[PDB]
Amino acid sequence: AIFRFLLFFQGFHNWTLNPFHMMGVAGVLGGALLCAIHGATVENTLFQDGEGASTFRAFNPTQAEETYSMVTANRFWSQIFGIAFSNKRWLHFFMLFVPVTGLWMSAIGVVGLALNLRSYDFISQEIRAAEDPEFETFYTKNLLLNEGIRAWMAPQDQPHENFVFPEEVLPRGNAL
Amino acid sequence: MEVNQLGLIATALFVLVPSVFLIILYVQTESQQ
């Protein structure tokens, strides 16, 4: 049922085009990246504090010492990526900031969609496309898909509307 | 393309106003030290 919700928002709201969703995407994927890159970094900048091949045992939760080298981690990422964290407090705050902000942004876009205040179209694209039948973009290609979704799922997905679409009105490319 | 004519000034001020704000704060921070 949630999958249908996803596809509904594509066909009717063109939700993938909404910059508030895109900020949510960047926040969620940004978080997951931060999550994986921070865990990986710590685990590969560990100090040798025990003798065994299992490095987990060599940590005591009451030790005062940092258990991995921030200095070496900073050099690594500075030389691999150009920039690196240098402040552990900023780093961990940033990990709070990124996915929390991302989610807040997508919520705002959904509030707009409550009103059908969609980012559905680009008017400039449509004016050109109407007048110029050789002009095609991935933008116009995706609206055709939206129009297919709407006409083909609406009768069964909104049964209280008694939509009867005879075969001849259904939008369809060649053969399919 | 027949784009919104105010999109240019919208975009220019959208960049310029908060960037200038940050630059003002940064430079006066540097002259403190």
Partner: peptide, 30 residues
């Protein structure tokens, strides 16, 4: 004008990359 605007912003981001890497505040130890 919109093409100029898009490319101008993108170019500003690349220049910022240059400064953020080569003209960063150097991290100093303790």
């Amino acid at each position: 004008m919109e093409t100029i605007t898009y490319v101008f912003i993108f170019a500003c981001i690349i220049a910022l990359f240059f400064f953020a890497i080569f003209f960063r505040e150097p991290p100093r130890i303790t």
